[PDB]
DNA sequence: AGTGGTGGCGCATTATAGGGAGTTATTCCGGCCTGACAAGAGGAAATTTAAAATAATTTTCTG
């Protein structure tokens, strides 16, 4: 449910909700496999971080038909 | 009048941005081949003038 909770943010960037939740699942798995409890870092933040890092990356890249650099998106 | 509470700083934790490294892909820099000019040579068509002949003018001779 955490992935679902964070996903509902990105809900209008030309992306089927389910694709969003899927990208979030990939990011969460990546965080879990990379999560470090011994490095000294709040687990939940680490997770959510990766979640966003994946979701925003996916929307930036595959949202628009003509793919556009991400810094350009930030400019917009 | 004392024990706790408040604020500020410290310690520990948390979050965010920039820089370095890579990597790709566009873009500048240089040599070398095309392309243009200037010249030179040998041989051949064209043009011009001089000389030689037919058809007309002038003079002379004949009827």
Swiss-Prot record:
Location in the cell: Cytoplasm
Chain span(s) of sequence motif Interaction with polymerase core subunit RpoC: 19-22
Region annotation Sigma-70 factor domain-2: where it falls in the sequence: 1-65
Coiled-coil spans in chain: none
Origin: domain of life: Bacteria
Family indicated by similarity: Belongs to the sigma-70 factor family. RpoD/SigA subfamily.
Role summary: Sigma factors are initiation factors that promote the attachment of RNA polymerase to specific initiation sites and are then released. This sigma factor is the primary sigma factor during exponential growth. Preferentially transcribes genes associated with fast growth, such as ribosomal operons, other protein-synthesis related genes, rRNA- and tRNA-encoding genes and prfB.
Domain notes: Contains 4 domains, connected by flexible linkers. In the active conformation, the domains are in an extended conformation, each making extensive interactions with the RNA polymerase catalytic core.
Summary of subunit composition and partner proteins: Interacts transiently with the RNA polymerase catalytic core formed by RpoA, RpoB, RpoC and RpoZ (2 alpha, 1 beta, 1 beta' and 1 omega subunit) to form the RNA polymerase holoenzyme that can initiate transcription. Identified in a complex containing RpoD, the RNA polymerase subunits RpoA, RpoB and RpoZ, CRP and DNA. Interacts with Rsd; this prevents interaction with the RNA polymerase catalytic core and with promoter DNA, and as a consequence, promotes transcription from promoters that require alternative sigma factors.
Name the UniProt record assigns to this protein: RNA polymerase sigma factor RpoD
Organism of provenance: Escherichia coli (strain K12)
Name of the gene encoding the protein in the UniProt record: rpoD
Included range, full protein: 385 to 460 of 613
